[PDB]
Every structure is written in C-alpha cells, then in structure tokens.
C-alpha cells in the first residue's frame, strides 16, 4: 500500500490469472490474450517463503520446568510461580501479536512493491512508444502484434524499431 | 488499428482471508496461514520420549514402595505421567516440601534402588502394619524398614554408611508419630525419641510428636518423610533412640531431560516431540494455545486463539 | 498560448514536537501523542473497585479481631488498603509466614466468620488481658478464644470439627508463649503443652517456649499465630494439653479479583479501573511511569518518563 | 523519508493549509488559490488512527500479584521476587522503546507515501499536457482556468481536450 | 529492495567508486569519468549511524541479582530460579534476533531508497532534455561538456538553456 | 550531439553476510558484530572495588575463620569467591545459607562494632583445637564460646538495644555437643534453650546432643543464625546453656555491592562489565560470555554472533 499499486492505479485483481501472481493483459489487432511474469511472481513468493522458514519449524526444546497449575492453596512461593508464568505468557503474546502485524504489513508492501517494479520496468522498456493511461495500462502508439507484445514481456523489445511510427501517431 | 494497449495487473481469489496489520485491524489478503496451534490429537505419544504411566500410583508413592506401585521398581522415564485417579493404600504419610521431593525425583528420571545392609542390631526389622497389605498380608513400604524393639529393648542406634561412589546417593527415611503414648511404648519401649540423620555437610534432626491425628485407614498415627543426599566422599550417620523408619538403601540421582506431568490423556502410538496435558500437539506452528504445561520441542504458549500470517498480496476482487 | 501552474504540498505546524525514530534520535513531526502516563490524580477512586480502607488496622489485625478493628467484621473487598499509620493495640503476637497468610486472605477478599461451637469442657473460656482492651475493660482477640485452666486443672482437649460445606474452611489458631514459668502454671496447670492441630491431609504440632521477651505493651509473653485449611469432607482435630488459643469458628476462603495494596492516598469518589499506591491513574495510555504496583486494568509500567508517538507527518516549516 | 517527497523535492510544508493534510495550490489566470485533497488526507489519518486503536487501551487486567516493596531484608526469596519484577519491567521498557521508534519510522514513511501517491496520480491524469518542474509543481502547458484546475482535483480532467493546445505550446 | 534500485535496474555496483557510496558515470566528447554525490552518501551514512548510536553504548547497569549456578540439589526454589533466568535469556534472545533481522531489512531499503532518490532528482533536473534508458542511465540529447555534467551533479543545470537543442534531437 | 550519464553505487571485493527478515543469507558491503563472545580473561580492579576472598568464603570472613582475619572490617563492591576456599575451624551449619550469604554480600561491608555484653557467671573466650590462631587454640573472632564457670552455668538474660539509626545484624550460634559428657563438661546442664528475641521477631533453638561425622576430628556441630534489630528495638538472649554468643553487631547497608564466584585473575584495567569468565567490553549491546554479570554489561543471549548491516547490498560486477 505504500507504493499504491495493488490498491492504487490497478483497481482490479484478475481472478482468472491462475498461472502466476502478476502478469500482462494485451489488446492488439490479432486479439486479446493474457500472460504471467514469473520473475515478479517468484519475486514475491521467495520473499514470503523466507519469512515462513524463519518461523515454521524453529521450536524450542524445554523438558523440566516449574509447576504451572496448583491444586491446593499456598502463599508467597505459589504467588511468585504464578506471576512468573503469567508475565512470561503476556510477554510472548505481545511478541506474537507484534510480529504477525508487522510481517503482514511488510507482506502487503513487498507484494505492492513487486507490482510497481514490474510496472516501472515496462514503462522504461517502452521508452517513448507508449503512454501511461493512469489505470495501470499502457497505450502503445504503434501496431504491436502478438509477437512484439511478447517482446515486451520477454525484455527483447527495441523501442528504436517502432519509435518513428509511435512518435508520428502521438504528435498528430 | 495502428495502436495497441498493454495492461498490467495482479491475481485475486474469490474468497480471501482477513489478517491484522499495523495500519488496519481487518484487511483481506489472497492467502494466509495459521501461526497458533489450537488443536490436539487427544492422546500422548509413546515416542520419541520415554513415557511412564503411573495409573493409580503417584511418583512419591512409587518411590516409597506402595504395594500397588511395586511394578515401577528400578524404572526410568523421560516423562512420568501422574493420573488424577491415583490413591494410596498404605500407612498415612506426610512429606514436608512435597513439591521439592517430587521435582528432584522427576528430574532425575530413575527409580534405581541399590539395596544396602545397615547395622540394625538390637532392634526388630521389617515391621508391618494392617494398613499396608501386600498379598493379603500385613506389610509396609518396600523401600522403608520399620524398626521396633527387640526383647522389649530399643538400644540407641548409631549406624554409618559412606558414599563410595562418584555420584550422589539419595536416601529416603521417615519418622513415626504414634497416635497414643501406649503405642510408643509398645513399639520402642522408650519415651519419645530423636532421630538425627547427619552427614559431613548436612544435619537433620526430627522430634516425634505423640498425638492423635484424624485416622486414615484406621491409623491415628502418622509418618513424616524426609530425604538426605550424600555426595561422593561423604558418609551417612543415623543416630536414633526410636521412632525411626529406616532406609533400605540409596536412590541414584541423575541429570537429564526427565520431568513430570499431570494428565488424564491416553498413551497412544505416534511420534510427537511436543507433549501437553491435553495431549501431544504438532510443533509446526511457532505458537500454541493448548496448555501452558509442555514438554519437548513445543510451540510457545500464547493467549491468542488464532494468528493468521498473510502468505499473499491483498485480495482486490473484480 | 498561455500556461497554468499546479503545485502539490503538505501541511506544516509552526513548532511541532520532537519524536524518536529508528533512523534518527530527534526528528520533528506535525503532531504527536503521549504514551507514558507519568501523572496521578492523587486519590484512589471508590469505583468501580470495592475499596476497604484498613485505617488503623492491618489485614491480619482485622482478621484476628483487634478491638480497634471490630468494624471490619464479616466485610468484603476488592482491594484492601493498608495504611502506614496502622498499629496493634492488643496482645503482642507473631505470625510465622506473615506474608503468606496476608496474601491468601487478601486474595480471598472476605472476612466472613461463621461462629462454631467447640466442646471446650474442663477449661475456662473467654480469656482476657490488659493489653487487649475493648472500650475500657480487659479483653482479647474477638475471633480467638483464650482457653485457660479451670479449677486448677487443664485436661487434654481432643475436640473434632468436620467440614460439611463444599468450600474450604480457614481456621486461625494460636499458641501462647508465657514469659514466666509462673504464668505457665497459673494459666494452664502444666509445664509444657503441645498443640497438635491435625486434619485428614495436613498436620501441625507446636511446642510452647516459656521465656521472657522484650516487653511490648508491658507484655513479655508472645502469641504465635498459625492457620490450617480443611478441605471439603476433611475433619479438624485439635489435641492439646495447654497454651492453646482456640478458634471460635472458621473463615471462608474464596478465589477472585480481590487483593491488597499498601498506600496512603485518600479514597476519593471517581471511576478509575487502574489503582496505584500513588493514586488512581487513567488507563488510556499503554504505558505508565507512576508505580510498578497496580490493581485493575492498568497500563504496563515502564522506566521511561515520556515516549512520544508521532500522529502526523514530518514537519517542514516555511520560515 | 524513503520516498523523498515530504522533505525531498517538495521541501516546503504549507502552514496555511488548515482544511487538509495534502492539497493543491492553483496558480493560474483568474488568480491563485489553495485547496486540500481529502482523499489522501483521510488516507494517512485512517492509517495513523489504526495504529492508535492497537496501542491506546488494550491494557492488561491484573488483580493479585507478588510483592514489589519490602521493608525488612529476607534473602533468597526476596531476591528472586525483586529480580522477576525488574526483569519484567526492563523487557516491557524495551518493547515500549522499540515500538515507538518503529511506528514513528512507519508514520513518516506512510505520510511520505500518501504525498507521493497524490503527486503521481496527478501526473498520470494530466498525461502529456504538463511537465514535472522537479519541485512538486506541474507546469501546465495550456491555459487552465479555475474550472479545469477543479477538474484536475475532481479527477474529471480529459487530456484530449487540451492535448492539441498543450503539445503545441511545448512543440 | 522495495524500490528495486540497488539490485533492480542498476544491477552493477561500481567497485571503482572509492570516494563515496553513490555517484555518477558520464560520457561526453571529452571522455568518460566517474564522480560521487556526497549528499546522497551522507544521507545513507547518517541513517545507519543513527541506528548504531541507539544500540552501541546503551548498556544497562545491574549489580545484585539471583544465583544462576547451583552445585547441590534443592528442588522447588532452585527450579524457580533456573526458570526465571532461562525465561529472561530466551526472551532477550528473541529480541536480539528480530532486531538484527529488522534493522538489516531497513538498511537495505534505506540504501535502496537513497539510490532511487538520487535517480529521480536527476531525471527531474534534466526535465525533457534526456530519456531514461531503463538501466539507471540517462541519454542526454544535447551537447553536454564536462561542465554541464558537473552542473547536473551540482544542481546548477538549467534545462531551458539546452531545451531547444535537446527537444530537436529527440523528436526528429 | 548526445551524451549519456549513468548513476550507480559502490561495491566491495569482499562483503559480509547478514540475516534479514526476507533472506537468511544476504551480502552487504559492511557489517558490525553485536554479540561480544570474547573476554580478556581477568577481572579489572576498576571502576568497581573488587575484594578477592582467596581461601575465604563470605561466611568464613563474617564468622571469623583464622585465615580470614585479613578481611576484618572490609568493604567491597563485588566479593569474588574462589573455588579453592576451605575452612579451618569448628564445623558449622548455617540454616538458609544462601540468604545470609546474599544479605552480607548486598550490604557490602564487614564492619563490626564490638559491644559489651553482661556475660557474668560464665567463662568467655572459649577455644577449640579445630580453630587454630598463631599455632594456638582459638575460636571464631566474632563469636564468644560461653562455658560454665566454677562448674556452674547460670541462666542468661542479657539485653542490648539498637540506639543507632541503622539496623544491627547479629550473628550468633548454638552448640550441638557430640557426647553427653561434653555437654556436661562445658555447660553443666543437660540441654539449653536459646531464645534470641526482639520486639517483633523471636527465635528459639534447642541443642541436639549427638554424634556427627567428624570434620577436623570434631564430632560436635554449631548452628549459625542471624538476627536484625531495627532502630529503637532491643535484643534479648534468653539461654540456659549451649550458646555461642555474639561479640557485637555487623553494619547492614544498601548499595551496589554483590558477590561473584570466579577463578579469574585480578588484573589492572578499567572495565564496567565483570563476568566470572573475566572482564568484557560493554560496547556491543549483547554478549555470549556468561549469564552472570555485574555492572554496565551487555545483555546475555543464546546467539553466538549477530551481524548488523552497516552498508548497502554488495552487488559486484560479474
Ligand atoms: C497458502 O499459504 C500456505 C502456507 O503454508 C501454503 O501452504 C503450502 O501449500 C503447498 C501447496 O502445494 C504445499 O506443498 C506441498 O508440500 C508437500 C511437502 O510438504 C512438506 O514440505 C513443504 C515445503 O516443501 C512444507 O511447506 C510442508 O509443511 C511439509 O513440511 C509436497 O510433497 C507437495 O508436493 C506436491 O507435488 C508432489 C509432486 O507432484 C506430489 O507428489 C504431491 O502429492 C503434491 O501434489 C506440495 O509441494 C505445502 O506443503 C504447504 N505448506 C504448508 C506449511 O502448509 C499454500 O500453498 C498457500 N496457497 C493456498 C492456495 O493454500
Ligand atoms: C480424639 O477424637 C477423635 C474424634 O474422631 C477420636 O477419633 C476416633 O476414635 C475412635 C476410637 O478409636 C475411632 O473409632 C473407630 O472407627 C472406625 C470407623 O468406623 C466407621 O463405621 C462406623 C459404623 O460401623 C461409623 O459409626 C464410623 O463413623 C465410621 O464410619 C471403626 O472401624 C473402628 O472399629 C474398631 O473396632 C473394630 C471392632 O471389631 C475393629 O475391628 C477395628 O479394627 C477398630 O479397631 C473404631 O470403632 C474413630 O474412627 C475415630 N475417628 C476419627 C475421625 O479419627 C480419637 O480417638 C480421640 N483421641 C483419643 C486419644 O481417643
Ligand atoms: C530479662 O531482661 C529484660 C530486659 O532487662 C527484662 O525485661 C524488662 O524487665 C524489667 C523488670 O521487670 C521491666 O521493668 C519494668 O518496666 C515497667 C514499665 O512500665 C512503665 O513504664 C513505661 C515507660 O515509661 C510506660 O509506657 C508504662 O505505661 C509504665 O508506666 C515499670 O512499670 C516497672 O516499674 C517497677 O517499679 C515501679 C515503681 O515502683 C512499680 O510501680 C512497677 O510495678 C514495677 O515494679 C519496671 O521498671 C521492663 O519493662 C522489661 N522490659 C524491657 C523492654 O525492659 C526481663 O524481665 C528479664 N527477664 C527476667 C526473667 O528477669
Ligand atoms: C491428646 O489428647 C489425649 C486425650 O484424648 C491425651 O491423652 C492423655 O495423655 C496423658 C499424657 O500422655 C496421659 O496421662 C498419663 O496417664 C498415666 C495413667 O493413665 C492411666 O490411668 C488414668 C487414671 O489415673 C486413666 O485415666 C488412663 O486412661 C490410664 O488408664 C500416668 O501414669 C502418666 O504419668 C506420667 O505423666 C505424669 C505427668 O502427667 C508424670 O508425673 C508421671 O511421672 C508419668 O511420667 C500420665 O499422667 C493420659 O492418660 C491420656 N488420657 C487419655 C484419655 O488419652 C494426650 O496427652 C494429648 N496429647 C497432646 C500432645 O495434647
Ligand atoms: C590458600 O590455601 C593454600 C592451600 O592450603 C595455601 O597454599 C599453601 O601455603 C602454605 C603456606 O601457608 C605452603 O607451605 C609452604 O610450602 C613450601 C613448599 O611447597 C612445596 O611442598 C608442599 C608440600 O608438599 C606442596 O604443597 C607445594 O605445592 C610445593 O610442592 C615451603 O617452601 C614453605 O616454607 C619455606 O618457604 C617459605 C618461603 O621461602 C619460607 O618463608 C619458610 O620459612 C620455609 O623456608 C611453606 O611451608 C604450601 O606449600 C601451599 N600449598 C599447599 C598445597 O599447601 C595458600 O598459601 C593459601 N593462601 C594464602 C594467601 O596463604
Ligand atoms: C531465661 O532466663 C531466665 C532468667 O531467670 C531463666 O529463669 C530461670 O530458669 C531456671 C530453669 O528453669 C529456674 O530454675 C528453677 O527454679 C525453680 C524455682 O526456683 C526459685 O524459687 C525457689 C523457691 O520456690 C528458690 O529456692 C530458688 O532459688 C528460685 O528463687 C526450682 O523449683 C527449679 O528446680 C528444678 O531444677 C533443679 C536443678 O536442676 C532440680 O534439682 C529440681 O529437682 C527441679 O527440677 C529450678 O531450679 C529459675 O528459677 C528461673 N529464674 C527465674 C527468676 O524465673 C529461664 O529458665 C530462661 N529460659 C530460657 C528458655 O532460656
Ligand atoms: C557413632 O558412630 C560414629 C561412626 O562410627 C562414631 O564416630 C567414630 O568415633 C570414633 C571414636 O570416637 C573415631 O575414632 C577416632 O578416630 C580418630 C581419627 O581417625 C583417631 O585419632 C582416634 O584414635 C584414638 O582414640 C581411640 C579410642 O579408642 C584409641 O584407641 C586410639 O589409640 C587413639 O588414641 C579414634 O580412632 C572415628 O574416627 C569416628 N568415625 C567417624 C566420625 O566417622 C561415633 O563415635 C559414634 N558415637 C559415639 C557416641 O561413640
Ligand atoms: C487510630 O489511631 C489513632 C492513634 O491512636 C487515634 O487517634 C486519636 O487521636 C486523637 C488526637 O486528638 C486523640 O485525642 C486526644 O487524646 C489525648 C489523650 O491524652 C487527649 O489528651 C486529647 O485531649 C485528645 O482527646 C485520641 O485519643 C486518639 N484515639 C485513640 C483511640 O488513640 C484514632 O482515633 C484511631 N482511629 C481512627 C479512625 O483514626
Ligand atoms: C546416638 O547414639 C549414641 C551411641 O549409642 C548415644 O549415646 C549413648 O547413649 C546411651 C543411652 O543413653 C548412653 O548410655 C551412652 O553413655 C551414650 N554415649 C556413648 C558414648 O555410648 C546417643 O544418645 C544417641 N543419640 C540419639 C539422639 O539417639
Ligand atoms: C523470448 O525469449 C526466449 C528465451 O527466454 C527466446 O527463446 C525467444 O526467441 C524470445 N522470443 C522473441 C525474441 O520473440
Ligand atoms: C533390591 O532388591 C529388590 C528385591 O528383589 C529388587 O526389587 C531391586 O531391584 C534390588 N536392587 C538391585 C539394584 O538389584
Ligand atoms: C494530535 O493528535 C491527537 C491524536 O490523533 C488528536 O487527538 C489531537 O486532536 C491532535 N492535535 C493536533 C493539534 O493536531
Ligand atoms: C561543481 O562543484 C564543484 C565543487 O568543487 C566545482 O569544482 C565545479 O566546478 C562545479 N561545477 C559547476 C559549477 O558547473
Ligand atoms: C572491635 O575489635 C575488632 C578486632 O580488632 C575490630 O575489628 C573492630 O574495629 C573493633 N571495633 C571498634 C574499635 O569499634
Ligand atoms: C551483670 O549481671 C549481674 C548479675 O547479678 C549484675 O549484678 C550486674 O550489675 C550486671 N552488670 C551490670 C553492668 O549491670
């Protein structure tokens, strides 16, 4: 949410994209299609996986401890034992609550960041051959078939090839 | 045509999950996982920790030698499970600092008892009572020797027993408090008495108190249980004029992962590092909400019921 | 062929407040809020917690039945307040494990005393002393029965008292330690009398120690106070030949939100869930710097005097 | 500070802005004015309000605890009671200090994020009819009166209406 | 890593830059050279320095504590003493691991942020006289001597001076 | 007619690996250690006043063992107890030994103002073969062994008020003879009750005549107790025999003083942090040397190393 991409200019999450987390939707003379960017998709997954590996499976081993349940009624010693455990449980619960909130806040932003980074990479790749419409879509000002649209996803898009046509359409 | 449109977007799920963040208390995400373990199998696993079910025997009752606890002799464990159904069918006993004796025995993790030969000359050994009955006959605690008079005389007792081993020896002894002064005479032929279990480092003196207590199992008298630990190179001296419930040897004290748990959960067949009084639980999640009492590789107890960690982006459905 | 200009900006405050961040120790923000409560109103509020001001009496003094504490008989509380001015104006007494008895009674939160009828045959009951004076006459602890010799004879007492209720009964008893051997004979007709208060689960034996102590209220003798708790279905047996301060009944013991606090603050009239010895404090902020001792829903005590949390952006003033 | 807008290229806070946290200052033919963007203002406020909901209140209810003040000297038992409370106080003090430092860092960044998000939304809305002068101000290359500037703030700005004029001025 | 500049479009760290942390590499008729922006360097250094001052030297003073080593066996009281110290050590150990992980995550991002801030400042300074090549490099479309390259670093670059030449070169 | 300007960051040939939230191993340009895991090996004499007990435990110096006479009326900030310590006096047992040891250590002084008690009718300055001073029979310096005078031991009722503004700590004892003949030969009475009483506290001890395991050829034992009289209180010692009388009071204070058990050398340096393993620097926030600490010390953690990133990510040229 810090970058304003997941809930920002992109106001729709494509429920039909099942092959990845981020991707491309194109409209060209040859029709409409959908694709996925695996680099950005694996980008979010690897970061989130690192948070999980740091938490899941890392349990402590404690064998002999103090009494934590008392049947009879005692004085000072029983009160101290109850206070120690109660303080310990309260402290760990705060650590759990703060950690869950922080990680989820970071998870939102890093997933938001990865979407924005994909958007910025595409914009720089298109150079002056397209314009940002403001809703997460680029209006390419040249005839792009299903080949050069794949070139933009492939990173093999040379703006010089279509620059003369694009500039002519834009400023006329 | 002469133009084209390229749109960038993210995925979304029809049914998302609500998680809590720093900014928002309720935000919807594509997917999430639980971090708090709140379910139990319902039974204690036999592995990888060596479990010992006391059934109708407490740890102290098994240590002293209650007739129903003779099956636990010289047995070791990683987690002694004490059941609420436990009772005692022997001489009524009171153990000062009961928790400490239970804790030290449980942590040691063994009930090994090497029989020793004391110089009980001049006194009658292996005393029995109607309350402690073994094989439908009058008996007593298996690890305790009830010393009474021999030929109507109770000579002053001065026995010695050195710790010739490289480990500490745990000695369990007791003092008899007769309910009536006549019972004091009928068993020890002397008025009152004193037992002083002393070592090169520790000293312990106990005075019998002859008096009527609320009779349990038709026994108005009581026995108080005490323990002594002799270190390697130390010697054990028992000075007494009567009312002495003598030890029959020493218990080996060890150091390990053993402990004690009070639960009424079944002992099943599975492999779970985490053991709780409610039953063995998985240790995949970092936190748990089953029981504050745990043993082994266990998640940390928290007051929270559920804690969902977002494993996806925000769910913004169309 | 003219133009227009659109500028975007944020707000700013003239002075602002300085807060602490991960990166910087002193950064200016537009607005912030305090998170550590370091002030108190000065008085304990009577609500919503039931306060009981001990005034001149410690909780044990009210329990035993000191004459100045008769106004606390059979009283309930959520937070008993013991004042530093409290004193004792009765027989000098010593309570082994005073803290534990004070702790469990405070947790129970009641001074209910259902008087019981023991079979005290052969002994003189309702003993009196000059140190314990009710109004202007010799008296003793109201909840304690000073059993003395009757007709120069003190036969052994072996009375019984079953616990027929479903709650545990708290019994407060004592042993008298005479200062002189004459007082030992003149009160109990014996040289030494053992006290054996026993139940089906626990047992307790006490030996009188005849000897002179530093005179408190001109009383060289002392009283040792012990307590026994009989569980439902359990029975109480008191075997004794003298020097016994017998109980007159049992105290009801419960479990709840009740506790005790040592404070000298006035008990005002307000609503504050958080109670500290320095006075009731608000429970809005997550942390406090007033006192580590708290009662009720209280902010967690921290060592910091102030911890400012920024509630706005960074302040960039124009001038 | 991560986005570098609050103290970055817009290194000037408008103290005159009292109706909102972020806004526009329209300098145009037909005069100069100031307005405030309620969407970005309420966005940052709601996030900060969310932080307060998690911190203000939520206090623990603890009735009976251990003694924390002692008149006489006892020894081992008293030492453990003092150690337990002192350890607890230090640990909670660390959590209080760390939380304030972390939240304040997040408060600075999210307010910076909201400012930057408003700036970029304006740029895409204007398309190619204006240029970022670098100080957070857009030099609109067509005659925009106090109506179409309201349209820019309204989100109702159509760049094609002025595209032919705007591009010609830039040429 | 959130901004995608240190490991993003700029995927090459200049090991030759020894005078600073961030800087400029320029090409002109006069040759190729390297420079450093000290403002962006000191911005990142101060942030990291603030984290150190909050940690280094801020030690507590504790004089008398509980016993932490026991030779004999005592039981209940000894178990409570062991439990308290082990609980305290476990809680502080968790705080140490989280603090190191959290600060290091922020250190990457704040260093990433300063890189992005330097890049965005240069783009706005160049206005419409250059185009972003997408790899952290700007293609300036006018004759820039070794002077105006210094002007871009110093902030004394007037885009209006070269705008007519730059715009003509771009759109022709 | 064109120019190109590239922006970049620095990189080092050899980076450092640090741990982040997202990644377990990420390379950065520079990092610093946060856990101190090394020690100089010796305790610094400054800025904390160290007192090396050498062959004397704190109780031995308090009681007055002949080898501990050099510690008389000495103050400290951290008493260092050595494992090589031994005792050459009458065998003694101190109930609640940890509390008395802790109480003396926290006070930080062994100041002893001698008082004049009215021990009339009894023989003072009793000596034993076990306690040897200047190759002559002696006793604890701060303790008075009261024996019979002319085969008579009158009943003792002595008084001593606390007329000062500080609490007085009194160390006294009770003698437990090994044989009944030794009890008669020293005290002329069969048993002597000792009742050290104040206006608030009272303490009564009964001697237990019996043989104990001989230490330094002494079958008899002495039990050591302490009493603290508050300002305005009076001290009453009621006794008929078997009393090891005090010779005065110890001043009790409140301060930074404590006690540490270590065998590390005492060098010359300035280190605020002191551990049993030796003085360590307090620059890093955390340490891994010893859980026992004194002074301005880093907080003990289980982690061996924790590297804090002090630079950007190292992205070297391929
Ligand atoms: C929502 O978030 C949760 C967070 O946990 C994700 O949960 C994981 O979901 C995947 C889905 O495929 C599970 O993957 C399966 O793991 C099996 C082994 O499990 C162990 O190892 C994994 C790590 O590899 C641990 O996470 C797990 O706890 C176990 O320790 C594999 O054997 C599975 O293999 C698949 O392919 C092989 C080859 O075809 C087949 O033979 C198998 O039958 C199976 O089809 C598979 O990889 C993973 O275990 C889940 N982890 C946890 C902790 O629950 C969710 O995926 C995510 N999304 C949704 C929609 O729920
Ligand atoms: C101080 O005061 C207490 C008050 O209780 C006295 O304690 C009681 O002492 C008497 C006498 O010893 C005990 O009597 C015994 O009771 C046993 C339990 O009887 C149960 O069943 C009967 C009905 O059959 C009920 O009325 C009763 O309440 C019980 O539920 C009997 O089993 C005993 O029988 C004896 O005689 C038979 C004869 O065949 C023998 O076979 C037995 O083995 C046994 O010897 C006996 O009658 C009574 O139980 C005690 N009560 C308690 C609570 O302890 C103390 O005795 C007194 N102090 C002194 C010094 O006397
Ligand atoms: C072991 O040693 C201790 C300490 O010496 C003794 O304890 C003291 O014993 C003496 C002797 O019995 C006690 O002295 C008596 O004190 C009374 C104090 O009460 C008055 O004074 C106080 C203070 O002014 C007032 O608050 C109070 O209201 C009273 O006004 C005196 O009253 C006694 O006076 C005697 O003479 C007068 C005048 O003739 C008579 O009227 C009296 O009846 C009495 O005979 C007397 O002085 C002292 O109180 C004890 N305590 C203390 C703390 O000192 C032990 O007694 C001793 N043990 C043995 C076995 O000998
Ligand atoms: C707990 O409560 C019980 C009662 O329920 C008490 O029991 C009494 O205990 C005393 C002391 O032990 C006993 O007294 C002794 O009596 C002997 C004779 O008893 C017989 O004769 C009498 C009639 O003369 C009968 O009533 C009785 O039933 C017997 O048939 C004496 O010979 C003893 O003398 C010894 O003590 C005296 C001092 O008391 C000395 O001078 C002597 O030299 C000798 O040493 C003694 O007097 C009494 O008999 C018991 N009665 C009952 C009914 O049990 C417990 O004492 C009491 N315990 C405590 C700790 O409180
Ligand atoms: C703390 O406690 C330890 C152990 O009790 C003490 O160490 C002993 O101290 C005594 C002196 O108090 C030493 O006695 C000396 O022995 C020297 C010979 O040492 C060798 O032989 C002995 C016996 O086998 C071994 O124990 C030892 O390790 C050596 O192998 C003699 O040379 C000494 O007398 C001669 O030398 C001195 C110095 O020149 C002269 O002044 C004398 O007049 C005489 O000529 C002396 O007899 C003993 O050796 C020490 N070790 C042991 C194991 O007992 C510490 O001293 C004590 N701490 C303090 C501060 O005193
Ligand atoms: C605390 O300190 C006080 C200080 O006084 C001690 O008090 C003395 O204690 C002893 C021992 O208990 C008492 O001695 C006993 O005295 C009895 C009465 O004697 C007085 O009265 C007679 C006339 O009735 C005079 O002739 C005599 O001189 C006294 O004035 C005697 O009857 C006792 O005799 C017993 O002991 C002897 C010797 O062993 C035997 O031969 C006898 O058979 C019998 O068993 C005994 O002599 C002394 O009287 C007490 N003094 C006072 C003033 O009370 C406390 O004892 C002490 N307590 C503790 C716990 O420390
Ligand atoms: C209760 O039992 C204990 C343990 O058995 C017992 O302690 C032993 O007492 C004897 C005699 O008091 C001690 O023997 C002495 O040991 C020392 C040191 O080894 C020797 O120096 C002594 O020798 C002299 O005395 C002898 C007396 O017969 C002479 O024959 C000899 O020639 C020497 O002059 C003597 O052997 C023994 O060391 C202790 N053992 C311990 C403490 O472990 C205690 O005495 C018994 N209780 C009673 C009241 O007797
Ligand atoms: C709690 O305890 C205190 C202290 O004992 C009680 O204080 C009362 O204080 C007044 C002060 O004026 C006493 O009155 C005065 O008494 C003297 C006695 O000589 C007399 O000369 C004066 O003319 C005046 O009357 C009062 O006696 C005293 N009360 C008692 C019982 O000591 C206080 O009353 C106790 N109760 C409460 C609820 O505070
Ligand atoms: C410990 O045992 C010793 C040795 O039997 C006891 O001392 C003897 O006791 C008898 C009986 O009273 C006397 O006849 C002897 O004179 C005593 N001394 C010796 C050297 O034998 C001692 O009383 C016992 N102590 C206890 C508490 O039982
Ligand atoms: C797209 O990239 C792949 C390699 O990932 C390459 O084999 C293919 O030829 C590319 N398609 C183009 C350049 O049209
Ligand atoms: C001691 O003898 C008993 C009786 O047979 C037995 O239970 C126990 O195992 C024996 N101890 C050893 C060490 O064999
Ligand atoms: C500052 O923020 C607090 C909490 O959000 C708010 O209650 C208060 O009105 C604000 N005051 C100012 C002057 O901004
Ligand atoms: C930029 O500043 C440096 C600072 O020394 C100076 O040497 C250089 O000439 C300046 N370049 C300009 C003003 O174009
Ligand atoms: C009492 O004498 C001892 C032994 O020399 C000494 O340590 C102490 O300072 C003396 N007390 C004084 C002089 O007040
Ligand atoms: C010491 O006690 C005796 C006992 O008779 C007494 O005479 C003497 O006066 C006392 N000493 C002092 C200094 O009063």
Residue numbers in the entry:
A (entry chain c), E (entry chain a): 330 to 501
B (entry chain C): 8 to 325
C (entry chain B): 8 to 326
D (entry chain b): 330 to 500
F (entry chain A): 9 to 326
Task: Quote the authors verbatim.
Through structural comparisons with other HA proteins, including novel crystal structures of COBRA HAs TJ2 and J4, we identified the residues primarily responsible for the variable binding patterns observed by biolayer interferometry. To investigate the molecular factors that may improve or worsen the recognition of HA by these antibodies, we performed structural comparisons of the NG2-Fab cryo-EM structures with representative HA proteins from the BLI assay panel. This included newly solved crystal structures of TJ2 and J4 as representative strong binders, as well as a previously solved structure of the A/Port Chalmers/1/1973 HA and an AlphaFold3 prediction of the A/Tasmania/503/2020 HA to represent no binding and weak binding, respectively. In TJ2, the presence of an asparagine at residue 145 rather than a serine creates the potential for a new hydrogen bond with R73 by virtue of the shorter intermolecular distance. This feature is present in all the strains in the assay panel from 2005 to 2012, which correlates well with the most effective time period for this antibody. The COBRA HA J4, while lacking this same feature, shows some evidence in the electron density map of an N-linked glycan at residue 144. Interestingly, although the same glycan is not definitively observed in the COBRA HA TJ2 electron density map, the sequence of TJ2 possesses a canonical NXS motif in this same region that would have similar potential. Even the difference in the absence or presence of an additional hydroxyl group, as seen with F159 in COBRA HA TJ2 versus Y159 in COBRA HA J4, is enough to alter the kinetics in binding via a faster dissociation rate. In COBRA HA TJ2, the lower hydrophobicity of S193 and loss of a hydrogen bond via A198 are partially mitigated by the retention of I192.
